[PDB]
Amino acid sequence: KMTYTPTFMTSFISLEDTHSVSLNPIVNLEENKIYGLVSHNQAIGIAVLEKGRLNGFLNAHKRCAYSVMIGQNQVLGFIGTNFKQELVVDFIVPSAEINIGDQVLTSGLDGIFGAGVFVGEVSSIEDHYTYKSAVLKNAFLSGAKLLRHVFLSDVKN
Amino acid sequence: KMTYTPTFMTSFISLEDTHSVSLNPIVNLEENKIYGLVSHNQAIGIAVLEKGRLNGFLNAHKRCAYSVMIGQNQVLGFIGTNFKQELVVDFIVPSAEINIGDQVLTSGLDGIFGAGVFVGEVSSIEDHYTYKSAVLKNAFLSGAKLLRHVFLSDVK
Amino acid sequence: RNMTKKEFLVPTRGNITDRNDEFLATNELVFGVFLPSGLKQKDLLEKIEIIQKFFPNFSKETLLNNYQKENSLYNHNLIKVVGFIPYATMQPLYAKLIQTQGIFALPLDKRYYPNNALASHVLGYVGVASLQDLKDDEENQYSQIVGKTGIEKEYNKLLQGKVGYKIMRVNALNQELATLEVVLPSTNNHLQLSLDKRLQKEADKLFENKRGAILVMDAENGELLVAGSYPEYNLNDFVGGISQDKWQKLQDDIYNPLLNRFANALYPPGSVVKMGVGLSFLENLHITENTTIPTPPFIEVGKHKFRDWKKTGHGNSNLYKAIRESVDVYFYKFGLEISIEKLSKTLREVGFGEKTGVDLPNEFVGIVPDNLWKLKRFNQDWRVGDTLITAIGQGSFLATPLQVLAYTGLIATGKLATPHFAINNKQPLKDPLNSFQKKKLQALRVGMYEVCNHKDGTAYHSTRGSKITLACKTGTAQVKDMEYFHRSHAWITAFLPYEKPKYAITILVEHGEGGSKLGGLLVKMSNKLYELGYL
């Protein structure tokens, strides 16, 4: 079981960072629980309540991380980012079969998002020997349309 | 919701530049809230009430910054400036597709401006690896004239 | 100018594969929670409290102990606080760990043996580099994962691969700029073995309540399709260090699970040597395969009587029949007339003195007892009785199941296979026989044929129900009313198919109480090879 509740941004946190936003408070959330953020049927980032302030850390922020699955065999990884602020799936098993263009969806195993929400598509693949990474394309980054109409993802803990 | 309230520039604050102006007081504003400034249906800078004075920090000023969106995909950045005092959109992800000539509008997400107010057009783009910047043309440059019909942008 | 920065590129330890590309040994991607080295005692405590929350199944203090310990990483910085975390366990934790600024969670490899105790004595296991291991091969340091036993050890260099490195320009923020140098790591580190996973599972099934060892071998090139040693043990219990509880269980198991019985265990061969002994007679004396002599229940020579295994005795008998019926006196009699120097030469030529050359560590050589050997060990003379008891594979005679196997494939083939596990180990056949000896081989084969197929044969009542024609020799080695540990051990070796030999099989059941009793196990393996199309 799971809830989507609407929310909206009041401002960016810094004016030197597009990946961090202040969100309008939402009645009885838990503090420090990590919530998912969804816009146009897509994952845009996560949200945490800290000292009474609801903060959104968007895709490619240092603090934005969550569990995703790739392709029809649901290959698992974790969302991070890199020095060029590209959205990356990290920590994939080296034996896994991934193809350029494979859909990437939330895995729904992290208690942040439910399963099956769209994230992006695999554009390239790095070998790091003990694991592989996948750089995404068609994922939310810098796009202003999806910062409106935003829903908070509350997965019952 | 959003409001425009009129005011006008009375004098320049600094004797070293045209980037900073005094505005005619406006009743019941909140102190330290950052408001947007608009003139001929264009973004010219921002305004803050501090210690009873309504101060306008125009496009080129070190303190003037706000959120804008570029082109049809509404790519996000922030207004700043550079070493040659050009008006710049800064903080753009390097993987974004923006082109010379793209319209630049206020994003309306910053609580300063509403969306869609005109800022300028992209004239060039510098790639800095970690980010890119876009230098603007046809933007309001903070010049010699003290404008009479400026409106303050109050987003609630 | 500025300054530069180095980063090693450490390849994942190579996979071990079955004949048909099944996984025998592989790696599992797991996690590890790390804290930076050189931290204040006050702060360190507060961070361990945080890590306590995420792993409530560990104690606030067991995590102190882990901090300063003989673990660590390959890096100039970071210390492993919790290790071996399953991917699924990390699933709700990864994001929460990311929220705390000075806490890192990193991907690690843990070795994994999918089949557990299958072929445990072939594959062997990897462990933490001992301080002596780092000395042995300086390059063991970048992984801290080295083979301890068996194939993991024998082929460590291969499986581990070569490190590469990457040197980079950096700024004060210690971020990466230009790559200045790259050397890539090795990649094809995998290893394919000749075992067949199905055939080994059969082998395990056959030794289900038994101790001993079993071997199947392609007699034309030396590939081992089976190599069981029983009890086997579960390789996964060693991977993260062995527990005090499981080490006791293995050490104090009286049946001795850690013992490799096909390569690192010695047993008296018994009657299995007889065709090697016979081959020496024919070579050194003035006699033939058809030389027939009287074979009573026993003989007397001086002060003592040398007894045949069954009371009744065995009438008149030649070489063919002495092999067939595992007859003792034929060999007693001609043993009187052969010098131990010449007999032992023939036995050592057919592969009983030395290592077969298997690609594992520490293969045992046997003892082919002779004159000079008894003198060096016991300082006692070589009485005729020694020649005689040796001519039936007992007394001071010891061999490995490997030796018997190689020996059996020499008889059947006419050339000597080096048994091996690594398919990419091109081991040429060896030709330690002269003209005369090779011709006499057929005689010997016909005998082995008769053991399994003639009605008088020792192994007739037991080796029926076989889809192919078999040729064998049984054996028994001294240590129904008899208590388990006093019982004689049991041998049976064999080649197949008789009409054109290709494979050899060699089976040994500890306390198997008689060699013929093992025909039911031989058929079952030879049928499994039929079932699976090897024949």
Numbering used by the authors:
A (entry chain C): 92 to 248
B (entry chain E): 92 to 247
C (entry chain A): 41 to 519, 533 to 588
Task: Paste lines from the article.
PBP2:MreC complex crystals yielded diffraction data to 2.7 Å and harbored two 1:2 PBP2:MreC complexes in the asymmetric unit. Diffraction data were phased by using our structure of PBP2 from H. pylori as a model in a molecular replacement experiment. Two “butterflies” are present in the asymmetric unit of the complex, but only one interacts directly with PBP2, the other one interacting uniquely with its partner MreC. Thus, MreC employs two distinct surfaces for partner molecule recognition, a fact that relates directly to its biological role of scaffold protein. MreC interacts with PBP2 by inserting its C-terminal β-domain between the head and anchor regions of the PBP, forcing the anchor region to “sway” by ~15 Å away from the head. The swaying movement is guaranteed by the flexibility of loops 50′–52′, 203′–204′, and 224′–227′ that act as a hinge, opening up the N-terminus into a “V” shape that accommodates MreC snugly. Direct interactions involve mostly the head region of PBP2, which recognizes MreC through a hydrophobic zipper generated by surface-exposed non-polar residues on both faces. These include Phe169, Phe182, and Tyr222 (MreC); Leu69′, Phe71′, Tyr127′, and Tyr134′ (PBP2); Phe169 (MreC); and Tyr134′ (PBP2), forming a π–π stacking pair. The fact that hydrophobic interactions (more feeble than polar interactions) are involved in PBP2:MreC recognition indicates that these complexes can form and be disrupted as needed during the cell wall elongation process.
